[PDB]
């Protein structure tokens, strides 16, 4: 599933991401935009053997276990496959963990969102 910006904004809001850890909703939508272009099925394999999964491109070395990544911490305590769900719940719950333990974790966020009017990402949306 490739989310629409607003649909994702609404879903993220529904998942309490708005101002989660002080990060306004647009941060998360923006992060998702640049991480996966809102594609819940996005996967990016890294040379380190880890893979970034889902709408928030959560890495399998630290956050989820995909069973093929060495040094798997699985801090989100989830199989990476959970991150490929069409609903964003697992990704959001993990993202909440990632941000709990700053959104810089998403190089994409720090680089394409941080420092911009991230709230622009939730404008026009029925929230």
């Amino acid at each position, epitope marked *: 599933k490739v989310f629409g910006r607003c649909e994702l904004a609404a879903a993220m809001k529904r998942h309490g991401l708005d101002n989660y850890r002080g990060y306004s909703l647009g941060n998360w939508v923006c992060a998702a935009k640049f991480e996966s272009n809102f594609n819940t*099925q996005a*996967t990016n394999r890294n040379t380190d053997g880890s*893979t970034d*999964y*889902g709408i928030l491109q959560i890495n*399998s070395r630290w956050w*989820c*276990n*995909d*069973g*093929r990544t060495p040094g798997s911490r699985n801090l989100c305590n989830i*199989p*990476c*496959s*959970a*991150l*490929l*769900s*069409s609903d964003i719940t697992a990704s959001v719950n993990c993202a909440k963990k990632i941000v709990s333990d700053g959104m810089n974790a998403w190089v994409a966020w720090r680089n394409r969102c941080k420092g911009t009017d991230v709230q622009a990402w939730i404008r026009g949306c029925r929230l």
Partner: nanobody, 124 residues
């Protein structure tokens, strides 16, 4: 987004055979592995067999490999478990499960995201 419905279970005599079927419906394209997990009463579950729909590669628990065969019918999004030379040790609840991409240990239930109700298989 995926529903798994098993059927084909039942009680058979040692040496007998049963063919479990698991029909997947829904977002079948999101399935990377369709597997069978079994669990005896009060015992830990065990990955029995799994197959990746796209490439058809099958995986088997050593205890059933060369005995059981798993087959996938992508046309019907149904995975089957041909249980040949059944033994008492095969008695258990057999669960169909589907794992999306992101889980690469076929016989490890951890990354399976969808589960069937589990069909009982009893071997006497």
């Amino acid at each position: 987004d995926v529903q798994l419905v098993e059927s084909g279970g039942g009680s058979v005599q040692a040496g007998g055979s049963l063919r479990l079927s698991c029909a997947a419906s829904g977002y079948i394209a999101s399935i990377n592995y369709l597997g069978w997990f079994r669990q005896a009463p009060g015992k830990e579950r065990e990955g029995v067999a799994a197959v990746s729909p796209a490439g058809g590669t099958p995986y088997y628990a050593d205890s059933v490999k060369g005995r059981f065969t798993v087959s996938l019918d992508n046309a019907e999004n149904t995975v089957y478990l041909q249980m040949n030379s059944l033994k008492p040790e095969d008695t258990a609840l057999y669960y169909c499960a589907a794992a999306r991409q992101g889980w690469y240990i076929p016989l490890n239930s951890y990354g399976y995201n969808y589960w069937g109700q589990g069909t009982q298989v009893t071997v006497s």
